[PDB]
């Protein structure tokens, strides 16, 4: 149908159809009379995956022959979403499969909806890993993602009576067509035990052994025939494990296999839970053995850093540092200083937050029991590091206690971030302002000691998933004017600037959005039975529920608009559909209250006859990658409204910019760079800058001051307190009111006036469709910087020491 | 190479080779440079299984079109063993695959050794189910095996320091190429809850739900293009299950899934363990819903028994009876009497033992908690049944308490065997003598009430696995003389009687055995590092370790031969290799001692220089179906020496007879029929008959009497007591001696003299190879009756009311 989706040649269509029927018969053991829709999806998935195998085998063979430096991306999260369409896109098979399935009498889009998301991540950090893998494959890097194959990914969110309910994401139930178990590469991982010191150095003995079994998933590059590997470890009990008593022993195998059972969803508050530590060590131990095995299959560890880069995705795999030391020192018998040199040059650390409650600080007593040798190595790293600090800053005793990897206190803890900085040759934040905040505040001491380690690598998103796949209409009208090269060279979108006054292009951009909004309005009626006005402004905030992300500020605005309507019902207002979506971490009480507030607001607003269809508030249930692919192209306004200094980068922001939504946001995270690229005139910037927040903290934030001086804010609070939004439970929202009035870390009230005013300027612009669209064009045209291809090229050159290559491997 | 293994046509070999390379590439994601031996096995398994699919789909389609009466074989055990060779045999693909793999540079036999046994059974009852499935497919019956897909089958046995060690049989670790998950047929199974009585009858409410997910495994008939289904249920938690607390809730899903985790290996002693009851109900509930679903997809349950037979393989699925009643009464609203009529006519029960400690007698309090509605139905069945007994035998109050399904006592129990008899139109034992023992003793009261219910169906073994597959040499020399028809018509083996004096045939039979013995002697050196004389008599006893099976009696004989040698070292004795193998139930202390005794005897005997290679005692580790396929063809003497009245049938006995071993045995179980078929002159029968045992029990068995009157027996006991076989632990075997002397239920000493004497007659015959072989020929020629095809044809005609058919389905 559309050009960017590839050729539907006669020979290819015929072959796809025959292979589809082959798989239906031989793989699914079905014929057309008994086939379920799920069978059809699997026949298609198997048909498509067949095209990956030659490329996958030869990509890996290529790396063995050429022996390039290998990139190991260690993450506990890979938020992959669905794989079928992505694979077709990157293989140029989409139109062909569409045709082939059409001739077979099937709707491919309906088949695509059957695939479960690989929801092996929580939010931004997990999706970043996924975008990165895609960019690394597209840029021809010898890169491997390493993580855990969770049996249960992020929970499915259900909303019952306005409340979030979690249910197990049993994503593997029907089997995953995209993975290949690799049992011959099964590796033992050790836990507990004790350290014996001999003449021949330390020995870690009496350990419990869990097996790590790898599963390989293909990561296809964009039309370059490169297929990289994502290797996820699953926990398996050894067969002599725990071996009435016989039965129990077999049942207790579950204990060892619990390690890979479930993704921790608490992206808000670090919990020192032992199972989480086991998961962190599990992925690190298995991965490092696999890395070293591959390194040897080419004595001399001097060349290790020339052949290996390990990227630590936050501190979650920080145990890579003492684990590498452990292997190098205890098993390979390198001296400490040489092992350390190798380690530092091998590892790099990416920080993804400044919220102190999110920092990993593992209780010493836990490491003592679980990983006794690692604790010893950590103490040793700390001593030698603190000797360096003492020498560089003689007499600065407070610097010593601030920089220590060991924090003294009630429970002694290890600061994993301090471990990562000490053990890495590079440390980067994920947006310019965030990287600066690291240098100036939380890692200031470390920056003063080793300024050369600190870098910025502004986040990006893959334009394959986040444009071509989810927004083919927009990709097509762009390709019509500038060709297809921009898909793997997003900077080329700048060429669209000379179309800002092009009437046809303005008409096309606005029509694509309208079509996207219509399709999403339909999706909402079909799957959720809710009726929205597609001519309204689509005002969307989708992201995990956090106080810092200030879904609450959006709530206050919603209520203001509602109250203004109720005050002057016969005044014209630009109609809005306000959509808020996102999961709350199950133990985050405030976030669950916020969700309930949102639904409670919807309950009042969506049923007020006076409101009509001028204002609708919808909570988007079960926000996840596949839902983002639908809602983002349909959005007009992107809410990026975190308190300045709190969102390290954001990536949702970039997805919206790429897909033709205007952004209302604070100068926070990557918003700053987005506004700089587009020009501030084409952005709706409001609120305190970082400096204003700091000034406020010095004086002391008094929420009452705002409540006393803003009558519209007072009314809202009074309505919240008195039970206007919870008639049967008048005090339901007292926690929220209390927090807002007395202990708001994120200064919701401080930005309220400016936000509302800025929101009026949004409504004003939307009244003028032509000028709205010209501003949109100016955003899309400048979103090039935010391609993860750019981010990855920067990592490759500035951190990993490898050159990207856009060259095809032979097909 | 050999004719019975099929044609190796040019077109087939070429196609097998190309499909093998296709699977290696596309399915295993490998090329020849990186392929492991396990990859080669899987490529072959996938290549072969491709040939099953058309036949499987059309067999099932056929049943839907023709709508024949369906046979449901309910078992908690299906001891399938390996599937690859069996499939090739039944599809006539063996020579072709052998050729194809040979040209690819692979040894197919080496590939076959990689396949794990499906060890979903303990011993005879589980193997019976497997042979039966094979015969039902071969006889063109619309038959389904239903059971549980255990994650862990029978434990792998390791022998450490002469002691049995169990390890988990993780048979699914690499994936099972022979199964197809059928998630669309997932069914809920209910546990716990309570019964509400309404106006509209009883209601079972507030239950916990476990999901039952079916996996289908093909059961190919012998060259008739029929492929039946074995459907095994796996336990899955529902997604709202149990839904810090979030993490635990996800982890607790294991509790529900524990149901299908592991096969209970306690074939010796009924344990009223709740998990076992859950497994029994699980397979019954899921199966019955599946049966009823299939019945409806053709209101009128009158025709249910015309369309459905359910065979209960022992009492383990006895809950089928009250479950059928429950569905019919509570869910379909049939009146009791009509539901009962339907139930009785639908169900038949096969008893597999008379050992009272093996009978299922479930504590009432367990049924109360787990299955409250079923208990109520059982009480109701009992009342109406006992009303029938009272009416037929007025005043016989003791009959009433003996026949009750409820046993009063300390804990009230339900006698599941009594439930099965009451709820079934037919009850059968598994050998003529066993069926008679049921009528005369343990079910006498029931036989007097309903004599028409009691039948015999003498056990059988499939000649496909147990001749063609494991003994191709013997199958071939037989086919050379009489053609190939006997493979699915084993009675034709009688034709071999006219070859008893045929010199060429005598030479061939003896040569096949010699080749088999050589191959097995090699197998023992290669995989276990033990060196045996292939010219010795192969004296084998392989079967689960039980006191009743009297491995101990064999032990006494072994020691007698050893002592006689030591007494007169320079006298000629026919050399023997004595092989004993079998697993002990992990909690069966005596059985574990017996294994230790056997190894301890081996330790002494195998290292006595005076003995030489005249006597060797070897414990065959990890006896299982795939090992039986090796050892049985190599055996000369089959030890079938259970105390008369204790082995219901035996089937190992039939395997040995078919494969050219002579049998030393008691008149017990099917031995009686084997001796009758072959003629007693061609059998080594010894020991007490059933009547002699009964006489002994009346007087009282005094083991001392034998110890006092048999000096050779005294010496053995003294040696056992004094530490001759355990020098470092002199009292190690005091339990055995004590049991033998004071509490031997199985009268080991009573048969000792006759056994030893009979064993001399065996040695005498073996001295004359020509006459040994002529007797062997006379056994093989009369083993026809013991084909499970005969057994199944009897079930079909006399119990299920269906005609077998040897006709091909179109290919
Ligand atoms: C891209 C690509 C290409 C080929 C393959 C081949 N895959 N080949 C096998 S046999 N895949 C297996 O299939 C099962 C699916 O039910 C999984 O449960 C199992 O984990 C997986 O290893 C996998 C991925
Ligand atoms: C269990 C657990 C513990 C901690 C976490 C942390 N999760 N941390 C995230 S999702 N960090 C996010 O990373 C993105 C990518 O750089 C940024 O754009 C975004 O600003 C930042 O908040 C998640 C789960
Ligand atoms: C005889 C026959 C013919 C075709 C098939 C087709 N089978 N097709 C699939 S996708 N089989 C799956 O394969 C996985 C193996 O790794 C299993 O883990 C899984 O349980 C099984 O359902 C199965 C049996
Ligand atoms: C957990 C558990 C509980 C009970 C059992 C019972 N297992 N019961 C067996 S294996 N019964 C056997 O059945 C064969 C087939 O008819 C007969 O030839 C044989 O004589 C008989 O002993 C097995 C496991």
B124 lines ligand 4 (CB under 6 A): yes
Q: Give how far A51 is from chain B: nearest CA, Å.
A: 9
Ligand 2 centroid from CA B251, angstroms? 24
Largest separation between any pair of C-alpha atoms in chain B: 89
Contacts of B645 (CB under 8 A, 6+ apart): B354, B433, B437, B668, B690, B693
Chain B residues whose CB is inside 8 A of the A183 CB are 38, 173-174
Ligand 4 centroid, distance to B351 Cα (angstroms): 9
Q: Is B53 in the pocket of ligand 3 (CB under 6 A)?
A: yes
B774 φ, ψ to 5°?
-70, -40
Nearest to residue A114, comparing CAs of A160, A159, A51, A177? A177
- Residue B684's closest CA among B735, B757, B610, B628? B757
In a 13 Å sphere around the CA of A186, the CA atoms on its Cβ side amount to 14
* A40 burial type by CB count under 10 A (0-12 exposed, 13-18 middle, 19+ buried): buried
Residues of A in contact with B170 (CB under 8 A): 239
Atom of ligand 4 nearest to the CA of B350: 16
Could you say which residues from 115 to 174 on chain B have a Cβ atom under 8 Å away from some Cβ of chain A? Answer: 152, 155-156, 165-168, 170, 173-174
| Length of chain A measured in residues | 811
Q: Please say if B655 is a catalytic residue.
A: yes
Annotated catalytic residue, options B17, B82, B316, B352: B352
Ligand nearest to the CA of B181: 3
CA distances B126 to A179, B121, B132, B707, Å, are 34, 5, 10, 38
Query: Closest ligand to B642 CA?
Result: 4
Distance CA B764, CA B13 (A): 50
Active-site annotation of A, residues: 352, 543-544, 549, 651, 655
- Give the ligand whose atoms come closest to the C-alpha of residue B49: 3
Determine, for residues B246 and A239 on separate chains, whether the beta-carbon distance falls below 8 Å: no
A436 C-alpha to ligand 2 centroid (Å): 18
Are residues B79 and B129 in contact, defined by beta-carbon separation less than 8 angstroms? yes
Distance CA A157, CA A581 (A): 10
What is d(CA A578, CA B282) in angstroms, rounded to the nearest whole number? 49
Tokens 């061939």 belong to residue: B508
d(CA B162, CA B618): 11
Q: Is the dihedral of CA B560, B565, B568, B572 positive or negative?
A: positive
Q: Is B460 in the pocket of ligand 4 (CB under 6 A)?
A: no
3-state secondary structure A331-348: HCCCCHHHHHHHHHHHEE
Taking the C-alpha atoms of residue A178 and residue A85, their distance in angstroms, rounded to an integer, is: 12
Q: Is A58 on the interface with B (CB under 8 A)?
A: no
B297 touches chain A (CB under 8 A): no
**Nearest partner of B661 among B772, B523, B768, B553, judged by Cα:** B772
**Eight-state DSSP code of residue A535:** T
Instruction: Kindly tell me the burial class for residue A500, based on how many C-beta atoms sit within 10 Å of its own C-beta (0-12, 13-18, 19 or more).
Output: middle
Ligand 2 centroid to residue A582 C-alpha, Å: 14
Nearest CA to ligand 2 atom 15: A125
Method: X-ray
Min Cα distance A606 → chain B (Å) is 30
B174 CB neighbours in chain A (<8 A) are 181, 183
> Cβ(A49)–Cβ(A20) under 8 Å?
no
Distance of alpha carbon A179 from alpha carbon A312, whole angstroms? 24
Which bin fits B40, alpha (ψ -120 to 50), beta or left (φ > 0)? alpha
CB atoms within 10 A of CB B810: 7
- Asked whether the beta carbons of B209 and B278 are under 8 A apart, the reply is no
The Cα of B295 is separated from the nearest Cα of chain A by a number of Å equal to 17
Active-site option among B47, B599, B651, B782: B651
Asked if B246's CB is within 8 angstroms of A265's CB, the reply is: yes
HSE-up of residue B647 (Cα within 13 Å, Cβ side): 32
Residues of A in contact with B244 (CB under 8 A): 271, 273, 586-587
Minimum-distance CB partner of B262 among A29, A30, A247: A247
Is residue B130 within 8 A of residue B216, CB to CB? The reply is no
- Give B454's strand partners: B427
Report how far residue A791's alpha carbon sits from residue A138's, in angstroms, rounded to the nearest whole number: 13
Tokens of B558: 């072994």
Place of tokens 């052994």: A209
Contact B646, B622 (CB under 8 A): no
3-state secondary structure of B179: coil
B547 lines ligand 4 (CB under 6 A): no
The closest ligand to the CA of B79 turns out to be 4
CA distance B156 to chain A (A): 10
Q: A218: CA distance to ligand 2 center in Å?
A: 24
Cβ <8 Å between B152 and A254: no
What order of strands is seen across the sheet that includes strand A615-620? A615-620, A576-581, A537-542, A637-640, A662-665, A684-685
State the Cα–Cα distance between residues A116 and A109, nearest whole angstrom.
Answer: 14
For domain B1-460+788-811, the CATH class is alpha beta
> Could you tell me which residues are beta bridge partners of residue A685?
A665
DSSP string, A603-643: HHHTT-TTTTTSEEEEEETT--HHHHHHHHHH-SEEEE-PP
Q: Cβ of B245 and A173 within 8 Å?
A: no
Which residue from B732, B738, B745, B667 is spatially nearest to B707, judged by alpha carbons?
B738
Return the closest-CA partner of residue A217 out of A78, A354, A382, A34. Answer: A78
Task: Tell me the chain A residues in contact with residue B271 when contact means C-beta distances shorter than 8 Å.
Answer: 244
Beta bridge partners of residue B164, listed in sequence order: B159
| Domain boundary assignment for chain B | 1-460+788-811, 461-787
Q: Ligand 2 within 6 A of A128 CB? A: yes
- Which of A133, A791, A103 has the alpha carbon at shortest distance from A431? A791
- Rounded Cα–Cα distance for residues B132 and A354 (Å): 67
Specify the DSSP class assigned to residue B128. Answer: H
Picking from A30, A213, A246, A257 by the largest number of B CB atoms within 10 A of its own CB, the best residue to mutate is A246
Range B248-255 contact pairs with CB under 8 angstroms and sequence separation of 24 or more:
B249/A168, B250/A152, B250/A168, B250/A261, B250/A262, B251/A258, B251/A261, B251/A262, B253/A168, B254/A254, B254/A258
On chain A, the residues whose CB falls within 8 A of the CB of B214 are none
Alpha helices by DSSP H, listed for A371-425, are 372-392, 397-403, 416-422
| Chain A hits for B234, Cβ within 8 Å | none
Is B241 touching A (CB cutoff 8 A)?
Answer: yes
Alpha carbon of B201 to those of B189, B330, B333, B368: distances in Å? 21, 7, 9, 19
Ligand 4 centre distance from Cα of residue B630 (Å): 22
Instruction: Using alpha carbons only, give the angle B758, B657, B94 rounded to the nearest 5 degrees.
Output: 150
Cβ–ligand 3 contact at B57 (below 6 Å): no
Is residue A571 annotated as involved in ligand binding? no
Q: Cα–Cα distance between A569 and A170 in angstroms, integer?
A: 48
Supply the DSSP string of B277-330, one letter for each residue: HHHHHHHHHHHHHHHHHHHH----GGGHHHHEEEEEESSTTTTHHHHHHHIIII
Compute the distance between CA of residue B56 and CA of residue B221 in angstroms, rounded to an integer. 11
Active-site option among B17, B513, B517, B543 = B543
Our CA angle for A450, A455, A456, nearest 5°, is: 155
Angle at B289 between CA B83 and CA A172, to 5 degrees: 60
Distance CA B235, CA B191 (A): 13
Nearest-atom number in ligand 1 for the CA of A52 is: 1
What is d(CA A86, CA A652) in angstroms, rounded to the nearest whole number? 19
A461-787: same fold as A1-460+788-811? yes
Which alpha helices (DSSP H) does A410-550 contain, by range?
Answer: 416-422, 432-437, 444-449, 463, 472-482, 503-528
B175 lines ligand 3 (CB under 6 A): yes
For residue B413, the cross-strand partners are B363, B407
User: How far, in Å, are A351, A370, A417, B174 from residue A358 at the CA level?
Assistant: 11, 22, 11, 39
Q: Which of helix, strand or coil describes residue B29?
A: coil
Specify the residue for token string 């600066």.
A436
The two beta strands, A118-120 and A78-81, are antiparallel
Of A165, A181, A184, the CB nearest to B36: A184
Q: What does the DSSP 8-state code read for residue A78? A: E
Beta-carbon count within 10 A of A355 CB: 17
| CATH architecture type of domain B461-787 | 3-Layer(aba) Sandwich (3.40)
Q: Do A57 and B31 make contact, defined as CB atoms within 8 angstroms?
A: yes
Give the C-alpha separation, B154 to B130, whole Å.
15
CB contact under 8 A, A250 and B152: yes
d(C-alpha B606, C-alpha B234), whole Å: 46
Question: Could you tell me which chain B residue has the CA closest to the CA of A218?
Answer: B29
Q: How far apart are CA B459 and CA B785, in angstroms?
A: 9
Q: What letter would DSSP give residue B641?
A: -
The DSSP letter of residue B53 is H
Helix (H), strand (E) at residue B100? helix B94-103
B401 is in an annotated binding site: no
Distance between CA A472 and CA A405 in Å, rounded? 49
Q: Min CA distance, A108 vs chain B (Å)? A: 21
Question: Based on the number of CB atoms within 10 Å of its own CB, is B504 exposed (0-12), middle (13-18) or buried (19 or more)?
Answer: exposed
Asked if B416 contacts B359 with a C-beta cutoff of 8 angstroms, the reply is: yes
Whether the Cβ atoms of residue B798 and residue B458 lie closer than 8 Å to each other = no
Q: Are A121 and A129 in contact (CB under 8 A)?
A: yes
CB atoms within 10 A of CB B645: 25
Query: Which among B538, B580, B532, B575 is positioned nearest to B556, based on CA atoms?
Result: B580
Residue A57 and residue B170: Cβ atoms within 8 Å?
no
Q: Which residues in chain A have their CB less than 8 angstroms from residue B173's CB? A: 183, 236
- As a whole number of angstroms, the distance between CA A352 and CA B312 comes to 61
Report how far apart, in Å, the C-alpha atoms of A469 and of each of A75, A93, A403, A485, B116 are.
25, 12, 46, 16, 43
Are A146 and A72 spatial neighbours (Cβ–Cβ below 8 Å)?
yes
C-beta separation of A808 from A225 below 8 A: yes
CA-CA-CA-CA torsion for A175, A178, A184, A187, nearest 10 degrees? -80
Tokens of A802: 């490898």
Residue B547 token pair: 């006191």
Number of helices (H), then strands (E), belonging to chain A: the values are: 33, 25
Contact A770, A764 (CB under 8 A): no
CA distances to A66, A329, A343, A799, B82 from A301, in Å: 19, 11, 10, 20, 46
Taking Cα atoms as reference points, which of A527, A501, A467 lies closest to residue A661? A467
Strands of B82-193 (E only): list them. 118-120, 143-148, 156-160, 163-167, 180-181, 187-191
């Amino acid at each position: 149908q559309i050009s960017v989706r590839g050729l539907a040649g006669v020979e290819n269509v015929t072959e796809l159809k025959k292979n589809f029927n082959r798989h239906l018969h031989f793989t699914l053991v079905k014929d057309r009379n008994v086939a379920t829709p799920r069978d059809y999806y699997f026949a298609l998935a198997h048909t498509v995956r067949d095209h990956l195998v030659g490329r996958w085998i030869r990509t890996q063979q290529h790396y063995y022959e050429k022996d390039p430096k290998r990139i190991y991306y260690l993450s506990l999260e890979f938020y992959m979403g669905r794989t079928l369409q992505n694979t077709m896109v990157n293989l140029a098979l989409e139109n062909a499969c569409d045709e082939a399935t059409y001739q077979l009498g099937l709707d491919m889009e309906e088949l695509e909806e059957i695939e479960e998301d690989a929801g092996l991540g929580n939010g931004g950090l997990g999706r970043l890993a996924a975008c990165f893998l895609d960019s690394m494959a597209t840029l021809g890097l010898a890169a491997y993602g390493y993580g855990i194959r969770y049996e249960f990914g992020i929970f499915n969110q259900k909303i019952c009576g306005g409340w979030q309910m979690e249910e197990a994401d049993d994503w593997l139930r029907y089997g995953n067509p995209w993975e290949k178990a690799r049992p011959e590469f099964t590796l033992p991982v050790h836990f507990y035990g004790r350290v014996e010191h001999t003449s021949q150095g330390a020995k870690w003995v009496d350990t419990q052994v869990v097996l790590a079994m790898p599963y390989d998933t293909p990561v296809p590059g964009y039309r370059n025939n490169v297929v990289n590997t994502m290797r996820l470890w699953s926990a398996k009990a050894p067969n002599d494990f725990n071996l009435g008593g016989y039965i129990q022993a077999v049942l207790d195998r579950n204990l060892a296999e619990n390690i890979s059972r479930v993704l921790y969803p608490n992206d808000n508050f670090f919990e020192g839970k032992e199972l989480r530590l086991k998961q962190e060590y599990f992925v690190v131990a298995a991965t490092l053995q696999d890395i070293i095995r591959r390194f040897k299959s080419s004595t001399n560890f001097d060349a290790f850093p020339d052949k290996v880069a390990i990227q630590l995705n936050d501190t979650h795999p920080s145990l890579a540092i003492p684990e590498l030391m452990r292997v190098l020192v205890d098993l390979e018998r390198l001296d400490w200083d040489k092992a350390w040199e190798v380690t530092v040059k091998t590892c790099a650390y990416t920080n993804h937050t400044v919220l102190p409650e999110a920092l990993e600080r593992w209780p010493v007593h836990l490491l003592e029991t679980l990983l006794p040798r690692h604790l010893q190595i950590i103490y040793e790293i700390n001593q030698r590091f603190l000797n360096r600090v003492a020498a560089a800053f003689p007499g600065d005793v407070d610097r010593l206690r601030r920089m220590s990897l060991v924090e003294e206190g009630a429970v002694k803890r290890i600061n994993m971030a301090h471990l990562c900085i000490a053990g890495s040759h590079a440390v980067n934040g994920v947006a310019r302002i965030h990287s600066e905040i690291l240098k100036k505040t939380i890692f200031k001491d470390f920056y003063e000691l080793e300024p050369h380690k600190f870098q910025n690598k502004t986040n990006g998103i893959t334009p394959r998933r986040w444009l071509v796949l989810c927004n083919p209409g927009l990709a097509e009208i762009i390709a019509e004017r500038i060709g297809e090269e921009y898909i793997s060279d997003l900077d080329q979108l700048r060429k669209l600037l000379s179309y800002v006054d092009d009437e046809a292009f303005i008409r096309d951009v606005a029509k694509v959005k309208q079509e996207n909004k219509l399709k999403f309005a339909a999706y909402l009626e079909r799957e959720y039975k809710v009726h929205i006005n597609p001519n309204s402004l689509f005002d969307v905030q989708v992201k995990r529920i956090h106080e810092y992300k200030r879904q609450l500020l959006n709530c206050l605005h919603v209520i203001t608009l509602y109250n203004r309507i109720k005050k002057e019902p016969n005044k014209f207002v630009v109609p809005r559909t306000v959509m808020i979506g996102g999961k709350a971490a199950p133990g985050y009480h405030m976030a669950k209250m916020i969700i309930k507030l949102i639904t409670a607001i919807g309950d009042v607003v969506n049923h007020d006859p006076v409101v009509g269809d001028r204002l609708r508030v919808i909570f988007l249930e079960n926000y996840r990658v596949s839902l983002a692919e639908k809602v983002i192209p349909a959005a007009d306004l992107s809410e990026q409204i975190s308190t300045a200094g709190t969102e390290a980068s954001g990536t949702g922001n970039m997805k919206f910019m790429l897909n033709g939504a205007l952004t209302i946001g604070t100068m926070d995270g990557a918003n700053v760079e987005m506004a700089e690229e587009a020009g501030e005139e084409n952005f709706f910037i409001f609120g305190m800058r970082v400096e204003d927040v700091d000034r406020l903290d010095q004086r002391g934030y008094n929420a009452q001051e705002y409540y006393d001086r803003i009558p519209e804010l007072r009314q809202i609070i009074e309505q919240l307190s008195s039970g206007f939004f919870s008639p049967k439970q008048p005090d339901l929202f007292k926690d929220i009111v209390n927090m807002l009035m007395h202990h708001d870390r994120f200064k919701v009230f401080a930005d309220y006036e400016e936000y509302v005013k800025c929101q009026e300027r949004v409504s004003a612009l939307y009244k003028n469709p032509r000028e709205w669209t010209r501003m949109v064009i100016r955003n899309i045209a400048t979103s090039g910087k935010f391609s993860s291809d750019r981010t990855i090229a920067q990592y490759a050159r500035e951190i990993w020491g490898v050159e990207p290559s856009r060259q095809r491997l032979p097909a």
